[model samples]
Target chain A: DQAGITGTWYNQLGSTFIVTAGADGALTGTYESAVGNAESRYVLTGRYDSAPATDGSGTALGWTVAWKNNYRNAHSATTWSGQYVGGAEARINTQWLLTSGTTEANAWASTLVGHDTFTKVKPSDQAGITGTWYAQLGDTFIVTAGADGALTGTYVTARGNAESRYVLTGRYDSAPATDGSGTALGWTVAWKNNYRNAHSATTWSGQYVGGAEARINTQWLLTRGTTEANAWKSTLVGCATFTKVK
Target chain B: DQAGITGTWYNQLGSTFIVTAGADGALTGTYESAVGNAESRYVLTGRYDSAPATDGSGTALGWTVAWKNNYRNAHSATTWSGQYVGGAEARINTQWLLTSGTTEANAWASTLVGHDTFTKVKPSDQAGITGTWYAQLGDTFIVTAGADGALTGTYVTARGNAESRYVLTGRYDSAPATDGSGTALGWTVAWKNNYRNAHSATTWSGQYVGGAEARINTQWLLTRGTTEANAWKSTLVGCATFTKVKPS
Candidate 1:
């Protein structure tokens, strides 16, 4: 079916987002926030489970979708987990700003229909990364590939002191193979630092640091890597695999 | 967070919805479909998260919570799941609504902050549910004891001819417990066959069968002997335990 105001999403700020279907049957939008800094001119488009054969097992349908600000170029691409018992075809497009810039990629999923199960969280091959990982900063984590791998990922900082560490499962390859021009993969595994972070900046970016200043600690990992820094933020110290998939 | 309107919500028939939020941070409005001759008054509210927690976690400081209609009601005593790393408490109020007013519940869990995943799929008990579950014509699931044994889930359904399905994680409770004035204790797992359900003629409703069915398919074992009536249009089914502190 088409995308309607399925559910509600909000930013770390007081901003709110409500995605709904347009009169034209296209996925449209409505965003509100107490912060008043929640206004943007946007046009988003995407497709999921377009064809049956897309998913090999025949149990899942495949869909590829990307949304750009059209005006801001701030965009993202998302893959949807199929519906239940061979559910209906689904697609979602919205103007909600998932991330502000390349430095930070914010992604989220919706439990719209009546089904909500997604793929496993794996590491990415952006550089054939293989190793332990950790969330050194905000949502951003570091996966230190042995010594012979290319460093890849965005740069970010930790949100708090040494409390909890988060890790990412699956591969960075979850999204289509595209470089900077490609959309960012949504959140994989998150860590809950028993300690809540207090920062002056309202923007908290959880990115993959390719290679800059690599350092993984008890709770946070710090880094500065480009798209192809020849390093991977696969595994970090202290950060374990978050197995809670709802 | 406060709400601002760009376009209004209309029924498939074209009637505009008066669903709006008031200045008092409370919802104040009603919505009606054009062709269906149906009108509803609901509010979309934005609940701000508490002050930025500080225990020296990650760089992200605070959480800005934005809740739509039934804010005070649904989020009254909610629990969240998330990753806690870098001295940060990642609590995810992952509970969302997929579809209820039906039989079989047809629920799923898609949102996860960490590796912690919780589903409201049937089997009601608090055990391991490894495969897929569905609430057919007449199937019952139970919720076992313990907080972590509680069920957190989403309602799943096919999009259209699309081979896959989508899920609505949070919404109304199936068999929520009430503490007198009927203030749902946690949320219950219930469904209906007719849009005119047991609670009200319009609540927890839908288009197909007038929205009158709700149940769960996934089964876990249960210690409580209490049984809830399964609704007809039950698509995604599951049991809900008010226990938020325990792991699901």
Candidate 2:
């Protein structure tokens, strides 16, 4: 029943939810918002359990998400609460809360944060990765892969009150094979951007989990200087799932 | 011969170098300045090896200190190079460099970053941590301990153009024995302040090596929430060693 909730899903706000369910009913993934949201992105790891149905019918799966939101210099301990909508495998209703308060007295709950319907996506091949991919808050990556496994792309992220766009260059660590049966392709890219005038590199690792579903963990390292010293400066870690269109 | 180099030392610039030399010749410590160094603190971890004497005579101990500079979002790969002056164990001659570049072409060497003479400090006891403590770049902590091992203090950190001062409270996880024979005590503290409007906590864990020589590894966690959404915002992680000041 709830197994259908796995994989990558996106809501109307362009917020992305890419989750992987473990064999033991554990949940792990990433969540990013659409444009208007203030917080940019988060590393989502949490656990889920089966709960009594809202209608007193039987059992339903519910979850508690912990958001290690680094973009805002904070931690949202109790981030999200969600349940599978009755009778609908692709529909999940949820509420968001700021339970991880700076002080014990500051934990807070918010209005119904989000409710969205999700559709499953199929995995894409190497050739299929040539278009635009978007994520939580408002960030976009337009990737173009060359015949030599080299990729050049543009990344635009919505930094609070400002937006950062930079040119990135990298090579595929592993390319998606033509047999349509290989693990996801991987790549490492570096960029020098105007955001704080920081230079950074990102290791985008993951694969297409089939069903047109693909997930990639983004390990972003922000540093200064034109060289490697920057690698130790600061790190911004995030993940995203993509469903290619054209 | 180099064994005399194993303690805490300071320079005229008010910069502190708290080092602990292991039996294996490994050296670990912290290096901080008294003024406006953006990345105010550094974790100095390195090794010392025997090298030809600077005068081309016998042998001398040379060191390479790799600094993990957390404040500037950078690393100084080969930050410090120094030697134990010929016949003196308590004196070291050093040259500092920002040689850890993101790339080979980016390595930029600076002028003599530091040239100092250090004097070893006596080991301090638990009761010795009650006064004001200062560190590299420009951060200060004024601590007051309770009879119950509880600690309350004010911590002020300089962040670029602005300075943040916050109230901090914590308790010693372990207390130093009355005879000062036990290992260094450990403590934890939590705080919230307006610098980025962040609330945070830190675990100060270490031991009083002896006299005023207490080295605490500072683990800081910063967080905040204007809404449940911003909770997963940003964080800064830092660790350092603190040596108390003399009666001034």
Candidate 3:
């Protein structure tokens, strides 16, 4: 009963899966990847997008996320041989956070062959977030939303100074509740480092952080110098959240 | 209103600051650095040996973080060229959930005119976290205490199927915060390639998926390929927090 979705989904890109289609002939939603298998059976989720399109049968396409699941400690573990199941039917199970609004769930299996089963547990949804934040010299900040559905934080310097403030203003490129844990992908965090006399002319740029177009694992590229010349830096400060004026 | 003075301090064999006694009293937590005008002060949070003997002031000598505030932001428009005035000082600030079951609020200040201030807000206490965490594949976890403290997740096939029914346990040289925010420094994530391991590590450690440590404005060393491997085959991955988490 949902339309748009966006978050992350990962599986053997080579393996096959199904997405749930709605009353409308068009499948819907957004998705990204986290960890991927090469040729094994896989899983997926949606954060701010909807299911993939269907030709009919009212079924979603090959790359759309069916549903999201929660993570659990008691879930059984299965040893993946690193190869994906070439021909497995896909289905979107909504047993977890069915209704929408960016909830979370883990990959679940009706049964376990040996040590394979899903343990679904949803973490608390968005709480009122609030705190100050700081970046290392010559750095900027950006926010990304997850099953918490959204992210909202305020910015201030440690020197008790305030800037134009920031709002992440976006959703996960992947879906919520998917295996990827709805972690933010990649994007540069820039500020008005060189604002022209006119606000419009102000230059907004930052270190280029790529990889979000395709959801993959997070990697710490570099340190302060000799490496991550572009990675974003932050001081050991706290954060704050706010409501959108919309 | 602070009392109960203490002293004693040490420096890494190779680092910026040094140690010395503060005049006027013993047991006082005062010291100086080998260098005078400098910037960048870091705090080492490991525990020292058993408490030192108390001096005549009833104050015990101990280690304290000594620093020189020589930081200046070259990018800021307003204070771009500003000189760092005051020197920098360091205090442990707030220590929560430490091995001692208690923590104290320390002090920190700096003199370098351009030096920006910072508070060390790490999770948990030092000493309690002496192990390391490996980022495994598919963690997709977010470090959202705020936007600044981003962490990357990697796969750790080497840690055995976990020591025991643990829920995604990860360790590093230091302890990570149970809370979602603040920075998790000096972390490394590597990928385990089937190509690299034919059977349970019959070969060398997994190929480098990525390197160790992803501090901002820092250098993350990257390496790939084996001795008889292709030089062009070796590649480097930059460690950065995903601005957004998603399913593809």
Taking every candidate in turn, the Cα RMSD to the unseen true structure, in Å, is 22.3, 24.5, 23.4
Error of 2 at B30 (Å): 34
Ten contiguous residues minimizing lDDT sum, candidate 1 chain B: B200-209
Q: Write the per-residue lDDT of candidate 3 for residues A74-116, one digit (tens) a residue.
A: 1111111000111133222111111111112311111111001
Ranking by TM-score: 2, 1, 3
- Candidate 3 ranges beyond 4 A from true positions: A1-69, A72-148, A152-189, A192-246, B1-36, B39-62, B66-248
Candidate 2: regions farther than 4 A off: A1-246, B1-124, B160-167, B174-213, B234-236, B245-248
A9: Cα error in model 2, Å: 9.5
The sequence of per-residue lDDT tens digits that candidate 1 reaches over residues B144-174 is: 3223212223323222111222111112232
Candidate 2 on A1-246: residue-level lDDT in tens?
346657777764456778875554345566665533237654454333322223322112223322323344222222333334334334543323222212211111111122233445321315655667665434677877556444466766554222466554333322332444323233333333344322223334333333455433221212111212221222222233444432
Q: Candidate 3 on B1-248: residue-level lDDT in tens?
A: 01211223222211232222223211112222223332354332111111222221111111222121224211110000000011133221111100100011110010011111122222221221222333322223222111221122223332222221111111111222233222223222222232332111000111111123321111121222122112211222122222122324
- Docking model 2 quality class: incorrect
The residue-level lDDT of candidate 1 at B186 comes to 22
Positional deviation of B33 in candidate 2, in angstroms?
Answer: 40
Best by DockQ: 1
Better TM-score candidate (1, 2): 2
**Real interface contacts reproduced by model 3, as a fraction:** 0.02
- Candidate number achieving the greatest lDDT relative to the actual structure: 2
